[PDB]
């Protein structure tokens, strides 16, 4: 059914490729890679981080509130 010969019809699309042995495995890995990673992080962070920030706030609040709950209340022994 799905085989390379008849997957789809495409026309006038020319692709140029290079042999692996003629090209470097890591081209500009840090000079270009690090800026690209920074760009991707910038694009994603606004959408990704805030839910986990809210989770951290909830977690800290819950832990502190439980610790307060276990703590003694002076008014109970006032009499």
């Amino acid at each position: 059914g799905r085989e390379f010969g008849h997957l789809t019809r495409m026309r006038h699309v020319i692709t140029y490729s290079l042999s692996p042995f003629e090209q470097r495995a890591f081209p500009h890995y840090f000079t270009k890679g690090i800026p690209n990673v920074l760009r991707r992080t910038r694009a994603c962070i606004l959408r990704v981080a805030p839910p986990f920030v809210v989770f951290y706030l909830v977690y800290t609040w819950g832990t502190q509130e439980f610790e307060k709950s276990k703590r003694k209340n002076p008014a109970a022994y006032e009499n």
Binding site: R11, H12, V13, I14, T15, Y16, L18, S19, F21, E22
Partner: peptide
């Protein structure tokens, strides 16, 4: 001599 591949895909 550069080992390379050029594909002009024209299914017509």
């Amino acid at each position: 001599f550069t080992g390379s591949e050029i594909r002009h895909r024209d299914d017509a």
